[PDB]
C-alpha cells in the first residue's frame, strides 16, 4: 500500500509512504493521514483499495460519488480496512483466570440472570 | 541427598521407548563404525 502511494498519490501522501508501517497503520495514524487529505484524493485512495466505485471522468457522476461516500465515511472505511488488528491471544493471556469482586459482581453488566 | 526425590520412572527409562524411531538412525552410525574398525584392523 505504501509502494502504491509512492507511485500514484506521492505529493498528497508524503507521510504515508515514507514512514514505517507501525507509524502508519494505527487508528490515529490513519485518521490523521486521511482526515487531512483532500476529499477527492481520499476517494481515489479508497478507489485504489476497491472500496468505492470507479471515480471516472464525468464531473456529475463524480459529485454523486463524493456525495454518496462523504469524507468521514471514507476515512472510517479506509481505517477499518487498513488498521492493525489486535492479536486477541495477547489480550487473553494478560487476563487472570480467577474472577475478582469486580467480576463476580458486575451488577449493571448482568441483567443476564 | 536430594536426587532421590527426583529419580522416577523416567530416569529408569520406562517412559522413553514407545517411539522407536531412534533405531534406524543408530543403525546408520553403527555400520560406519563396523567398516571403520575393519579398515583399522586391515593394516594390522
Amino acid at each position: 500500500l505504501q509502494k502504491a502511494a509512492f507511485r500514484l498519490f506521492n505529493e498528497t501522501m508524503k507521510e504515508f509512504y515514507v514512514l514505517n508501517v507501525s507509524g502508519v497503520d494505527t487508528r490515529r495514524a490513519l485518521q490523521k493521514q486521511f482526515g487531512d487529505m483532500n476529499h477527492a484524493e481520499v476517494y481515489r485512495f479508497a478507489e485504489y483499495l476497491h472500496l468505492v466505485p470507479a471515480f471516472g471522468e464525468d464531473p456529475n457522476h463524480q459529485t454523486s460519488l463524493l456525495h454518496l461516500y462523504p469524507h468521514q465515511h471514507l476515512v472510517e472505511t479506509i481505517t477499518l480496512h487498513c488498521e492493525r488488528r489486535p492479536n486477541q491471544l495477547t489480550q487473553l493471556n494478560e487476563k487472570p483466570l480467577f474472577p475478582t469482586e469486580k467480576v463476580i459482581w458486575d451488577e449493571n453488566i448482568i441483567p443476564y440472570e | 541427598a536430594d536426587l532421590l526425590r527426583n529419580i522416577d520412572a523416567h530416569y529408569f527409562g520406562y517412559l522413553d521407548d514407545e517411539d522407536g524411531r531412534l533405531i534406524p538412525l543408530e543403525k546408520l552410525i553403527e555400520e560406519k563404525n563396523i567398516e571403520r574398525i575393519n579398515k583399522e584392523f586391515a593394516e594390522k
Binding site: 509512492f6 507501525s22 | 536426587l3 532421590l4 529419580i7 530416569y11 529408569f12 531412534l22 552410525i29
Partner: protein, 285 residues
C-alpha cells in the same frame, strides 16, 4: 542403571554419556541426557555445550532458559544468571530461522526492562533478529519504536547509527538490482527507498532533541532547540510551543519559561498574528 544401586550410577553415566557424545547421535543423546539430568542436574551446563556443538540450537536455548530460571548465585561453570541470560540472547538473536520454539521477541524486550545498562544494544539485538529473518519491515518497526522509547543519548546514538546503516544496506542492494535489471518499476521501488532513507536523515535533529525532552522535559532550553528544529515549519513551531509551555514545570525549569512565552508571542508577532501574540501574553500572565 536398573540393575545397579542408584548411588553407583555415576560410574555408569560417565561412560554412557561419554560413549553417546562421541557419535553423531543427537536424537538419542537428547533423550539420554534429559534422563541423566534428573540425577545430576549440575551437568546441564555441559549438555548445553553439547547441543550447541551438534547445532541443536532450539534445544540448547530451552536448556539455557532452565539454567536462567534456576536463578543460581553462580552456576557450576562459574557463570551468574546475568551471564547465562546474555548467552541466551546471543544464541537466540543470531539464529532466527532455527530458534523456532521460544518467543524470541518477548525475551529481548523483557531484557530491556531489566538490563538498563545496555538498552541500546538490545534494541539492535531485537532488530537484528528480524533482519537475519529478512522481516525488514519488522526490523524498521523495532528501530522506529526504539528511537521513540530510548531515553538516553548514549543509547539513541547506537540505535540511530544502526538504523541508518541498515537503511543504506537495503538501498545498496536495491540500487544494484536496478543497475543490473534496468526495470522501470524496480527503479521506482529504488527511489521510494531513497525517500525513506533521506527522510530518516532529515529526522536526525528532531529525534535527537526529542530524546533530551524525555530525560527532563523541564529543560526549557531543549524546547527552544525543539522550536528551532522546526524552523520554517511555522505550524509545528507553534504546536511544539503549546506542548512546551504546558510540559515544563517552572519550579525546576532549566533556563526559564519566560523565554518560551515571549518567544512564542514574538513568533506570532514576527508573523503578524498579533491577536495570537497578545493571547499568548494573556495566558502567560
Amino acid at each position: 542403571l536398573r540393575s545397579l544401586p542408584v548411588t553407583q550410577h555415576m560410574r555408569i553415566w560417565t561412560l554412557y554419556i561419554g560413549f553417546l557424545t562421541s557419535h553423531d547421535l543427537p536424537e538419542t543423546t537428547i533423550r539420554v541426557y534429559r534422563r541423566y539430568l534428573k540425577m545430576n542436574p549440575k551437568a546441564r551446563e555441559d549438555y548445553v555445550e553439547y547441543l550447541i556443538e551438534r547445532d541443536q540450537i532450539d534445544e540448547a536455548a530451552k536448556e539455557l532458559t532452565t539454567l536462567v530460571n534456576q536463578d543460581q548465585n553462580v552456576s557450576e561453570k562459574g557463570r551468574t544468571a546475568h551471564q547465562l541470560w546474555t548467552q541466551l540472547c546471543d544464541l537466540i538473536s543470531k539464529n532466527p530461522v532455527k530458534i523456532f520454539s521460544l518467543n524470541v521477541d518477548a525475551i529481548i524486550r523483557q531484557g530491556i526492562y531489566r538490563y538498563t545498562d545496555q538498552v541500546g544494544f538490545l534494541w539492535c539485538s531485537l532488530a537484528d533478529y528480524y533482519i537475519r529473518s529478512a522481516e525488514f519491515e519488522r526490523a524498521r518497526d523495532v528501530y522506529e519504536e526504539a528511537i521513540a522509547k530510548v531515553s538516553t543519548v548514549r543509547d539513541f546514538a547506537q540505535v540511530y547509527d544502526a538504523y541508518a546503516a541498515f537503511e543504506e544496506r537495503e538501498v545498496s542492494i536495491m540500487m544494484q538490482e536496478v543497475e543490473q535489471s534496468g526495470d522501470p518499476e524496480e527503479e521506482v521501488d529504488l527511489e521510494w527507498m531513497f525517500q525513506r532513507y533521506q527522510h530518516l536523515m532529515e529526522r536526525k535533529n528532531e529525534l535527537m532533541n526529542s530524546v533530551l525532552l524525555r530525560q527532563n522535559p523541564h529543560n526549557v532550553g531543549e524546547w527552544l532547540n525543539r522550536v528551532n528544529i522546526y524552523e520554517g515549519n511555522y505550524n509545528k513551531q507553534i504546536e511544539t510551543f503549546k506542548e512546551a509551555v504546558k510540559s515544563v514545570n517552572p519550579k525546576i525549569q532549566v533556563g526559564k519559561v519566560r523565554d518560551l512565552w515571549i518567544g512564542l508571542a514574538k513568533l506570532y508577532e514576527d508573523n503578524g498574528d498579533l491577536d495570537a501574540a497578545r493571547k499568548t501574553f494573556e495566558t502567560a500572565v
